Each structure stands twice: as C-alpha cells, then as structure tokens.
Amino acid sequence: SMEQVAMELRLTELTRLLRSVLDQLQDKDPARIFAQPVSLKEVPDYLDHIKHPMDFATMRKRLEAQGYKNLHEFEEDFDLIIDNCMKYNARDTVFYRAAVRLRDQGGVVLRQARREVDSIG
C-alpha cells in the first residue's frame, strides 16, 4: 500500500538522522574504548556481570538494518554502553572516566536530536 511505503520512508529518514547522531556520539570516544564488544576471550566473566552488553559496532549493525523504530530505542542502547561500563569498572579507571565524558558530551547531541525528530515528525 501507499501508507506502508510512506511509513517505510519515515523509517529511512529516521535511520539517516540516527546515523548522523551515531557518528557525532562516536566522535566523543576518541580512544575507541566503546567501538567494539567487550571480548569474552579477554574478559571471560563479563556476562556474569553485564546482562545486556552494548557497543558502537553493535549499534551500527542494528541501525543499518533499520532496526531502531524511534529515538528512545537508540538512546536505550547508547545508555547501555555507558551504564555497563560504569558498573563493571571502578571510578578510578580510564574506562569509567571515558564513559562519564561520553555521557556528558553525548547529552548535548541527543538534546538536539530529540528536537529534530519531533520537529520533522
């Protein structure tokens, strides 16, 4: 139907906007600490601690399949990246500290993303 096509176009357009958001957030991780999944070869107990792992590569896979239906779903995955890191790692670590800085810098980008998503519909 035409209604289904129009809904598909809206999802494609959201996908384009989320890809720009993802690129902007990932620039706030210049050390690439969050670029890839925590390796279970290297951190074999990770899944005993963290029940829903997340990372930027995994979000990019989901995004390119158009698997984010709305900005809430995308933000949920970004907050998992931060929140997982701040539980597994202590305050005095480069990991924890990178997550704080990504959270603080990302909030700015996400504040305007929410306005754009709402504005454009």
Coordinates of C-alpha atoms in Angstrom, one line a residue:
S1 CA 0.0 0.0 0.0
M2 CA 0.9 3.5 -0.2
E3 CA 0.5 4.0 3.6
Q4 CA 3.2 1.2 4.1
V5 CA 5.6 2.9 1.7
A6 CA 5.2 6.2 3.5
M7 CA 5.9 4.5 6.8
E8 CA 8.9 2.9 5.3
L9 CA 10.2 6.3 4.0
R10 CA 9.8 7.8 7.5
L11 CA 11.9 4.9 8.9
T12 CA 14.5 5.5 6.3
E13 CA 14.7 9.1 7.1
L14 CA 14.9 8.4 10.9
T15 CA 17.7 6.0 10.0
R16 CA 19.6 8.7 8.2
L17 CA 19.3 11.1 11.1
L18 CA 20.3 8.4 13.7
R19 CA 23.4 7.6 11.6
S20 CA 24.5 11.2 11.9
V21 CA 23.7 11.2 15.7
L22 CA 25.8 7.9 16.0
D23 CA 28.7 9.5 14.2
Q24 CA 28.6 12.5 16.4
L25 CA 28.5 10.4 19.6
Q26 CA 31.3 8.1 18.5
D27 CA 33.5 11.2 17.9
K28 CA 33.2 11.8 21.6
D29 CA 35.1 8.4 22.1
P30 CA 38.3 9.2 20.6
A31 CA 40.2 6.4 22.4
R32 CA 37.7 3.9 20.8
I33 CA 37.0 2.4 24.1
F34 CA 33.4 1.8 23.1
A35 CA 33.9 0.9 19.5
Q36 CA 33.6 -2.9 19.8
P37 CA 32.0 -5.6 22.0
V38 CA 33.9 -6.4 25.2
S39 CA 35.8 -9.6 24.2
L40 CA 34.7 -12.8 26.1
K41 CA 38.1 -14.3 25.2
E42 CA 39.8 -11.4 27.2
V43 CA 37.1 -10.8 29.9
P44 CA 35.7 -14.3 30.4
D45 CA 33.4 -13.5 33.3
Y46 CA 31.8 -10.4 31.6
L47 CA 28.3 -11.9 31.1
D48 CA 28.2 -12.8 34.8
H49 CA 28.3 -9.0 35.5
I50 CA 26.6 -7.4 32.5
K51 CA 23.4 -8.9 31.2
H52 CA 22.9 -6.7 28.1
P53 CA 26.3 -5.8 26.5
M54 CA 26.4 -3.0 24.0
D55 CA 29.0 -1.1 21.9
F56 CA 29.1 1.2 18.8
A57 CA 29.7 -1.6 16.3
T58 CA 26.6 -3.5 17.5
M59 CA 24.5 -0.3 17.3
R60 CA 25.8 0.4 13.8
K61 CA 24.7 -3.2 12.7
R62 CA 21.2 -2.6 14.1
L63 CA 21.0 0.9 12.5
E64 CA 21.9 -0.3 9.1
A65 CA 19.2 -3.0 9.2
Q66 CA 16.8 -0.1 10.1
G67 CA 16.3 -1.7 13.5
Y68 CA 15.7 1.5 15.5
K69 CA 12.0 2.4 15.3
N70 CA 12.3 5.6 17.3
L71 CA 15.0 7.7 19.1
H72 CA 14.1 6.1 22.5
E73 CA 15.2 2.7 21.3
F74 CA 18.5 4.2 20.0
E75 CA 19.1 6.1 23.3
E76 CA 18.4 2.9 25.3
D77 CA 21.4 1.2 23.5
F78 CA 23.6 4.3 24.0
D79 CA 22.9 4.4 27.7
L80 CA 23.7 0.7 27.9
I81 CA 27.2 1.4 26.6
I82 CA 27.7 4.0 29.4
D83 CA 25.9 2.3 32.2
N84 CA 27.5 -1.2 31.6
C85 CA 31.0 0.5 31.8
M86 CA 30.2 2.4 34.9
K87 CA 29.2 -0.8 36.8
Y88 CA 32.0 -3.1 35.6
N89 CA 34.8 -0.6 36.0
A90 CA 35.7 1.4 39.1
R91 CA 35.7 5.2 39.4
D92 CA 39.5 5.4 39.2
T93 CA 39.8 3.8 35.8
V94 CA 40.3 5.2 32.3
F95 CA 37.2 3.2 31.3
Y96 CA 34.8 4.7 33.8
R97 CA 36.2 8.1 33.2
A98 CA 35.7 7.7 29.4
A99 CA 32.1 6.8 29.9
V100 CA 31.5 9.9 32.1
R101 CA 32.9 12.1 29.3
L102 CA 31.0 10.3 26.6
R103 CA 27.7 10.7 28.6
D104 CA 28.3 14.4 29.3
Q105 CA 29.3 15.2 25.7
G106 CA 26.7 13.0 24.2
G107 CA 23.8 14.6 26.2
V108 CA 24.3 17.8 24.1
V109 CA 24.0 15.9 20.8
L110 CA 20.9 13.9 22.0
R111 CA 19.1 17.0 23.3
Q112 CA 19.1 18.5 19.7
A113 CA 18.4 15.1 18.1
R114 CA 15.2 14.9 20.1
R115 CA 14.1 18.3 18.9
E116 CA 14.8 17.3 15.2
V117 CA 13.0 14.0 15.4
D118 CA 9.9 15.8 17.0
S119 CA 10.2 18.8 14.6
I120 CA 10.4 16.8 11.3
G121 CA 8.0 14.2 12.7

